[PDB]
A paper describes a structure:
The extracellular signal-regulated protein kinases, ERK1/2, are key components of the MAP kinase signaling pathway controlling cell proliferation, survival, morphology, and migration. By contrast, ERK2 is unusual in that only small conformational changes occur within the active site between the inactive, unphosphorylated (0P) and the active, dual phosphorylated (2P) forms of the kinase. X-ray structures show that dual phosphorylation of ERK2 at T183 and Y185 remodels the activation loop by forming phosphate salt bridges with several Arg residues. NMR Carr-Purcell-Meiboom-Gill (CPMG) relaxation dispersion measurements showed that dual phosphorylation results in a global exchange behavior that can be modeled by two conformational states, named ‘R’ and ‘L,’ which exchange on a millisecond timescale.
Structures of 2P-ERK2 complexed with inhibitors #8 and #16 were solved and compared to previous structures of 2P-ERK2 complexed with VTX11e and GDC0994. Both inhibitors #8 and #16 formed contacts with active site residues that matched those contacting VTX11e and GDC0994. Unlike VTX11e, the 2-chloropyridine and isopentane substituents on inhibitors #8 and #16 respectively were located more than 6 Å from Y34. Both contacted the backbone of strand β1 at angles that allowed but were unlikely to force Gly loop closure. In contrast, the two nitrogens in the triazole ring of inhibitors #8 and #16 formed separate hydrogen bonds to K52 and W1, respectively. This separation had the effect of shifting the K52-E69 salt bridge position relative to GDC0994. As a result, the Gly loop shifts to a more closed state, allowing the pocket below the Gly loop to accommodate two water molecules that form OH-π interactions with Y34, and favoring outward movement of helicesαC and αL16. In this way, the R-state inhibitors VTX11e, #8, and #16 share small but systematic movements that lead to Gly loop closure and movements of helixαC and αL16 in the direction of the activation loop.
Residue numbers in the entry: 5 to 356
Write the structure that this text describes.
């Protein structure tokens, strides 16, 4: 057994001596997740190494995920057990977020399993149960997809990866102030392309719609081959937008773009999903609604007939202290965000 830090696929995981036996789970552009063993609590954990400090955007995404998840406690949202980083800011090159280990994710499960309607129904209920809490906190997740839905054999489901999440205080108009090119391509609402700085939390409902379609068929519904291809896939099934929906698009340049497209008819849902529950296809239609204002909201989605076996507002917590603009003060130099990340994580340090 080496004395130095363990290393997974070339990435040092300086998490010893409490956390050992690291195993690769997955990775992103500036981070890697491994499973590990907590020798102090005698439990299996997942550890998310983030290395963001060279770029302001990565620092913003690290700070947000930490601040939001530390302030969240909900059965359908992954919690933070512990955060590891260096004792001084000059030494801190990485941050390690420790979470309870989940057995798999929905992306992996769908590679090997055709889900029963009951499993689809229960997974969908739980996604929306957690989303209800998220939206009640004035948070947008902005990256819901199968690989961010964690699953246990008991069918417990937890949403993870809040790196793309952010607060939008509804006392302020965020139109024109939101980041473009959010979400993962196949799961992007049309307005992320057509209203790239002025979308709302209804993009999360669009993503959930895409996830439901994927549970129904084990394949992505809108597998765009590149950024501009994505809208074409969406319209290829929804059909060309109605004049009404078109005339709701405030960005003239985007409206003219849509007028310039050849007309596509709508593909009926039961043609794509001929074996699906009719109730499930109705909720899918409401979630994959082109117009973001007519698109169903999370509470109405929970109240939909498809989910009536589970819908229970008395057992569906919401945020007791919804987030406000103080959680949005991060348009700052990456050197200053590094200080804020150091301060948010000090509560896990010896001393403090
Ligand atoms: C580098 C960031 C990455 C791309 C996205 C991301 N961000 N936060 C998380 C948290 C987990 C996680 C947590 C707990 N348990 C498992 N378990 C699991 C999932 C699949 N297999 N296994 C064993 N994962 C996973 C991914 N995550």
């Amino acid at each position: 057994s080496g004395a130095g830090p363990e290393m997974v696929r070339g990435q040092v995981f300086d998490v010893g001596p409490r956390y050992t036996n690291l195993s690769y789970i997955g990775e992103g552009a500036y981070g890697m997740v491994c499973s590990a063993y907590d020798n102090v609590n005698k439990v299996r954990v997942a550890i998310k190494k983030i290395s963001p400090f060279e770029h302001q955007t990565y620092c913003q995404r690290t700070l947000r995920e930490i601040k939001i998840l530390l302030r969240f406690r909900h059965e359908n949202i992954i919690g933070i057990n512990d955060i590891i980083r260096a004792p001084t800011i000059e030494q801190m090159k990485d941050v390690y977020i420790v979470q309870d280990l989940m057995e798999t994710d929905l992306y992996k499960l769908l590679k090997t399993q055709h889900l029963s309607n009951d499993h689809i129904c229960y997974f969908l209920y739980q996604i929306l149960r957690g989303l209800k809490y998220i939206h009640s906190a004035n948070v947008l997740h902005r990256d819901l997809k199968p690989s961010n839905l964690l699953l246990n054999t008991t069918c417990d489901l937890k949403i993870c990866d809040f790196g793309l999440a952010r607060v939008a205080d509804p006392d302020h108009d965020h139109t024109g102030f939101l980041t473009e090119y959010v979400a993962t391509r196949w799961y992007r609402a049309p307005e992320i392309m057509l209203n790239s700085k002025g979308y709302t939390k209804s993009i999360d409902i669009w993503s959930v719609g895409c996830i439901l379609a994927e549970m129904l068929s084990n394949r992505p519904i809108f597998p765009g081959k590149h950024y501009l291809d994505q809208l074409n896939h969406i319209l290829g099934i929804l059909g060309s937008p109605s004049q009404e929906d078109l005339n709701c698009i405030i960005n003239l340049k985007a409206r003219n773009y849509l007028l310039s497209l050849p007309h596509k008819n709508k593909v009926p849902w039961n043609r794509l999903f001929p074996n699906a529950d009719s109730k499930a296809l109705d909720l899918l239609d409401k979630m994959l609604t082109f117009n973001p204002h007519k698109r169903i909201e999370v509470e109405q989605a929970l109240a939909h007939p498809y989910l009536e076996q589970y819908y229970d507002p008395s057992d569906e917590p919401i945020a007791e202290a919804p987030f406000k603009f103080d959680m949005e003060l991060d348009d700052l130099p990456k050197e200053k965000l590094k200080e804020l990340i150091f301060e948010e994580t000090a509560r896990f340090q010896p001393g403090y």
